[PDB]
Amino acid sequence: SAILISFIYSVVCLVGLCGNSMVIYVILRYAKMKTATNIYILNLAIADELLMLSVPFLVTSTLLRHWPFGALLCRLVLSVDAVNMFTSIYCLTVLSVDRYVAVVHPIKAARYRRPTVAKVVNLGVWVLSLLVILPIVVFSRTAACNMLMPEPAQRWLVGFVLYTFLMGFLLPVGAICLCYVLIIAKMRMVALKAGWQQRKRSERKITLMVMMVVMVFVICWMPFYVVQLVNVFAEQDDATVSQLSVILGYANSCANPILYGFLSDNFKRSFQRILCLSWMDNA
Amino acid sequence: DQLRQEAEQLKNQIRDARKACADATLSQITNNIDPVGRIQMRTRRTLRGHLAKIYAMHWGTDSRLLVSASQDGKLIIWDSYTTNKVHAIPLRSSWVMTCAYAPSGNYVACGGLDNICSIYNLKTREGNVRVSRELAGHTGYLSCCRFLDDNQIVTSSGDTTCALWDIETGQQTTTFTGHTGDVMSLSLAPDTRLFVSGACDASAKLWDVREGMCRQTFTGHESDINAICFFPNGNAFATGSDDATCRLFDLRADQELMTYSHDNIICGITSVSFSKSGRLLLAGYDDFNCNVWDALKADRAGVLAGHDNRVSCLGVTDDGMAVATGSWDSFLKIWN
Amino acid sequence: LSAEDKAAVERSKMIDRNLREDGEKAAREVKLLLLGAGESGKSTIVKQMKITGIVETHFTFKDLHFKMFDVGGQRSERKKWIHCFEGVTAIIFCVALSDYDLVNRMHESMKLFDSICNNKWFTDTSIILFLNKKDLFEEKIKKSPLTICYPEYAGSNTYEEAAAYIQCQFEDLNKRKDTKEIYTHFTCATDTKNVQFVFDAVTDVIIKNNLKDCGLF
Amino acid sequence: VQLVESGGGLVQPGGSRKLSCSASGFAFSSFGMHWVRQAPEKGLEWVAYISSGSGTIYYADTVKGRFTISRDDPKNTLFLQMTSLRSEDTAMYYCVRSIYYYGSSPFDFWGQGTTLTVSSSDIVMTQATSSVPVTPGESVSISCRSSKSLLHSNGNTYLYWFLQRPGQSPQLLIYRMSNLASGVPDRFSGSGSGTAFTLTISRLEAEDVGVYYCMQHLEYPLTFGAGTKLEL
Amino acid sequence: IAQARKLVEQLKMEANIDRIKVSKAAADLMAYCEAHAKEDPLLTPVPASENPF
């Protein structure tokens, strides 16, 4: 099981990597990042790449059962994980806010929707992430690379398992279902009174493509953040369980470009470019 | 009524005239010349700041400054050695299809559907860029305006006419007629004496300025015309039509010499230009890219594809060290 | 590496800012494009609201400024001055319900509508479609059915049938009905009905645009 | 054009004082501004520079801390605030202009200035001469020498030549060691390189007698000569 | 008739001009192209010194 799941781990890691790196290569040159959109997408792809570039280490920690990389590494890898995860979950939210304020406030939002704002909020995201994840480095050391905060370990352990739960699962899900539901209400209200709207059109498409970017994000990170609570408030656990939970937590970060990437007009065009180029190259 | 016959006889006589002087077939002369080679260019500089399409541009006599005109109601001046902005002038009519930079460097000029070539002064105390004149007298849409001095400009309008003017007064000092359609271009000579025009009637005309009357007519296309320029020696010029073809006319033999086409091209030209040695003709197509040609062999020698949309304007500089292209994607470029 | 070429950059770093501030402010002044048959209804369609070559216009409604660049009075070719209007937000089309017999006119308007709704620069460009001079159409058919101009039509030579027939015959020429939409309305204002229709249609088109400027399709 | 200055007067040592410039006739908001200074019988010294947008401010190594420059673009008004005065700050101050862009002409309009009196690694430019007798028709050539090369690698020569007649205020003559201003004749010129700079007149005439000065704008601060008087 | 007299006078004002053959024109063109082919910064790329771009 360890060998097979390690192969699957490499698969997932490299496919995510390809996704969130091709996204950057496209958005950097052929798309010519100008607006805030391309700022947020680049930041998100970066975060994803980093969160994903640290699978093998934990895949050995599951297989080797020891840390042949050093204490400094046992701190740095874990911290990097934490910061990539949280900044990704915050970039999703800032994107799902960039839209509500762009169809329902398409007049005033001009003052907000600028590049400087994008860059400063990105920096603030990384800042907040580091701030919320430093307690890992401050108390990390080879045990099994884990956290061993002072006693009661339970107090510190669960204190942190609930600091991340809230600020990486609830605020974003409390500001991504809302900001996805104050869009459909409009798109409906301002449809009937146009003089052409028969049985609703384009809502059959923007009600399905919206309840799909709120299904994966909530079905992937849920299992993890619920089984944690279980294991730490019922005293039960198992290996394959946490393995599944982890592979999922790191799976959401592979299917994103397929949502916030290739489905963007700029991406579609700048990718048709390289597509036809390679068609002329190898065919 | 019956006078329409002498017209045909005189046309036949003129055909025989400009035909008897043809025994060369220029392409048959350069059989022994060594070709240019192959020409690749690199986008040295890029110039941003426009928020919409740009419709023309013009360089300066110092090879370093240039000017652009766009639909966002803006006329911008660039320092092409540092991609810096010297001036940004706001316009009144955003339907703009012309621009100009005077030789002295003092004044500039725009023009569009408003039927007015507003003329601006750049070097004024009070630290600003004021509009010195608004020149009216047309009933069409300015398609090109070009200076002669700081006090003599020339305009070409879609009402089938062209005009020479005088600024301090504002009154047409000359009018040029003889067209049967929309004029869409212009080109002045290096001796600033006799210009040339080319109209949607599939015909071009070689004028005079002092006198006022046409001097020669030129045909050979099968469709309308959209661009025209000279050849350094003020003894030839080149037309670019929407039939994908570009042609070279001479002024001493009254005929065309070489035709520039290729079956794999169907789109329409928008702009044309030459080089300081008249050995390489630049052409801007509507297939989102540009082209390059050799004016003595008819065979291409390069391409300048770096544009994600149409190529509306283009212009080589005096010294020679650079080239430019304007595109509907709102990004100016500087090759070399 | 630079002496006074560093104040020639605090200049180009303010010029750009001012350009933006002048480009992030055209949006709220949307740009329509009136049209019409031969001197049919281009008169009052401009003055529905009451605040040199090509005609401009300006009327305000709920913090939204409309500019109606009427162009039906420029005597040149249908083309060389038309791609100067791409990027526009919408298009209007004012046709008469009863003038078809003059000279027929309905045919000319249909040819125009076909030349418009399939142009190279108006694929993604939506359309509005008004139907003016209606109170008179209630009579022209009352005595002269439209079979004069549509012999293939057979039905109630009356308002609620013939009018809907013409509407559904004009709302079906678009060779593509997924990309762009096509609206309809009639000219019974109450001094303010139509312009409200334009407001609704234009906000809907603004949405359908932002929902591609944000990938949410 | 106009550029008036007010605020000058007579104070006691240690006090503080304000000085105000008022412009009339140009796009103030598009123009840098300085405050040059001159003592009773000495040369000129630079003291400040504010830019377009207010996002740039310099000072002299002598004054940082107690002199505060300020600008109000709407009412077209400049300001200098002084704290902790001394006797070395007794002088006449001049409001000035400066616009920078390719083809510019800095220091193209000097004001008239106010007067302030009280009780009791920088480049140097050597202006040796202090008197020269002449008579009309005489063609002269004044000298200015530096302690470093003024020519920047971009092909220029950041030197300036000024002038100041009695009971008047200065009047630019040359900018960048070769180029000539607008409002003066072809009688004046200049040339040289790298610490050697020669001015050139032809067919002298009254209204030219005064004290020519020298200046460099290669890098801040800015330094002046010491007065090449030109009498008969 | 409205514009069938001055038009013909003009068309006559054209045919009455000397017209050289084409070979001399081609020769002049190629000669101007040769005598200046050394200062064509695009036909003969210059080193990166005299190339401020």
Cβ neighbours of B126 in D, within 8 Å? 1, 25-27
- As a whole number of angstroms, the distance between CA C212 and CA A267 comes to 12
- Chain D residues within 8 A of B64 when measuring between CB atoms: 102
Q: Which of E4, E17, E46 sits opposite B3 (nearest CB)?
A: E4
How distant, in Å, are the alpha carbons of B118, B277, D149, E29 from that of B28?
48, 21, 60, 14
Q: Does E31 touch chain B (CB under 8 A)?
A: no
| Residue C22 annotated in ligand binding | no
Task: Quote the Cα angle for D218-D223-D224, to 5°.
Answer: 120
Q: Is residue B78 less than 8 Å (CB to CB) from chain C?
A: no
CA-angle at B41, arms to B37 and B42, nearest 5°: 155
Residue E24, CA atoms < 13 Å, CB-side half-sphere: 8
Of the partner residues A103, A193, A196, the one whose CB lies closest to the CB of residue C207: A103
Q: Is A140 helix (H, G, I), strand (E, B) or coil?
A: strand
* Residue C59, helix vs strand vs coil: strand
Q: Which domain holds residue E9?
A: 1-53
Rounded to a whole number of angstroms, the distance from the CA of D218 to the nearest CA of chain C is: 6
Q: Does the beta carbon of C14 lie under 8 angstroms from any beta carbon of chain B?
A: no
Joined tokens for residue D69: 């420059």
Q: Count the residues in chain B.
A: 336
Contact assignment for A209 to C216 by CB distance below 8 Å = yes
Distance from CA of D62 to the nearest CA of B (A): 32
Please name the method used to determine this structure: cryo-EM
Residue C180 annotated as lining a ligand binding site: no
Tell whether C93 lies on the interface with A, counting CB pairs under 8 A.
no
Crossing angle of helices A71-103 and A178-192, in 10° steps, is: 20
- In a mutational test of the C interface, the residue from A40, A95, A103 whose CB has the highest number of chain C CBs within 10 Å is A103
Residue B47 · residue B80 · CB < 8 Å? yes
**Contact, E39 vs B320, CB < 8 A?**
yes
The closest alpha carbon to D7, from D111, D133, D145, belongs to D111
Please tell me the distance from the alpha carbon of residue B274 to that of residue B289, in angstroms, as a whole number: 17
Exposed, middle or buried: residue B71 (CB in 10 Å: 0-12, 13-18, 19+)? buried
State the resolution, in angstroms: 3.4
Q: Is C11 on the interface with D (CB under 8 A)?
A: yes
What the block records as the tokens of C174 is 């678009």
Radius of gyration of chain E from Cα atoms? 22
Residue C164, CA distances (Å) to A198, A265, C20, C97, D9 in order: 16, 38, 47, 11, 88
B and C: number of Cβ contacts within 8 A: 56
Q: How many angstroms away from the CA of B81 is the closest CA of chain E?
A: 7
Which parts of A207-238 fold into alpha helices (H)?
216-234
What is the count of residue pairs from B and E with beta carbons less than 8 Å apart?
141
CA–CA distance, A74 with A141 (Å, rounded to integer) = 6
Given CA atoms D151, D157, D160, D161 in this order, what sign does their dihedral have?
positive
- On whether any CB of chain A is under 8 Å from the CB of C201, the answer is yes
> Shortest Cα distance from E39 to chain B (angstroms)?
8
Q: What is the 3-state secondary structure (H, E, C) of chain D?
A: CEEEEECCEEECCCCCEEEEEEEECCCHHHCEEEEEEECCCCCEEEEEEECCCCCCEEECCCCCCCEEEEEECCCCEEEEEECCCCCCCCEEEEEECECCCCCCCCCCCECCCEEEEECCCCCCEECCCCCCECCCCCCCCCEEEECCCCCCCCCCCCEEECCCCCCCCCCCCEECCCEECCCCCCCCEEEEECCEEEEECCCCCCCCCEEECEEECCCCCCCECCCEEEEC
> What type of residue is B220?
G
Contacts of B284 (CB under 8 A, 6+ apart): B269, B270, B271, B272, B290, B291, B311, B312, B313, B314, B325
On whether C40 is known to bind a ligand per the annotation, the reply is yes
| Interchain touch C–B (≥3 Cβ pairs closer than 8 Å) | yes
- Whether residue B114 and residue C52 make contact (CB cut-off 8 A), yes or no, is yes
Tell whether C2 is in a known binding site. Answer: no
Residue C5 assigned as binding residue: no
Q: Which of B5, B11, B21 to mutate to test the interface with E (most CBs of E within 10 A)?
A: B21
Residue by residue, what is the 3-state secondary structure of chain B? CCCHHHHHHHHHHHHHHHHHCCCCCHHHCHHHCCCCCCECCCCCEEECCCCCCEEEEEECCCCCEEEEEECCCEEEEEECCCCEEEEEEECCCCCEEEEEECCCCCEEEEEECCCCCCEEECCCCCCCCEEEECCCCCCCCEEEEEECCCCCEEEEECCCEEEECCCCCCCCCEEEECCCCCECCCECCCCCCCCEEEECCCEEEECCCCCCCCCEEECCCCCCEEEEEECCCCCEEEEEECCCCEEEEECCCCEEEEEECCCCCCCCCCEEECCCCCCCEEEECCCCCEEEECCCCCCCCECCCCCCCCEEEECCCCCCCCEEEEECCCCEEEEC
Q: Could you give phi then psi for residue A136, rounded to 5 degrees? A: -75, -55
Q: What is the C-alpha to C-alpha distance for residues A71 and A86, in angstroms, rounded to an integer? A: 23
Specify whether the CB–CB gap between D13 and D119 falls below 8 A.
yes
- Looking only at the bridges linking them, the beta strands covering B153-157 and B161-164 are antiparallel
Nearest-angstrom CA–CA distance, A31 and B242: 31
> Which class for B229: exposed (0-12), middle (13-18), buried (19 or more C-beta within 10 A)?
buried
Q: What is the CATH number of the domain that holds E17?
A: 4.10.260.10
Which residues of chain B lie closer than 8 angstroms to E3, CB-CB? none
Substitution target from D97, D100, D150, D175 for chain C, most C beta carbons within 10 A: D100
Contacts of C3 in chain D (CB under 8 A): 152, 158, 217-219
> Residues A25, A271: contact at Cβ < 8 Å?
no
What domain count does chain E have?
Answer: 1
From CA D133, how far away is CA B301, in angstroms rounded? Answer: 69
CB distance D127 to D148 below 8 Å: no
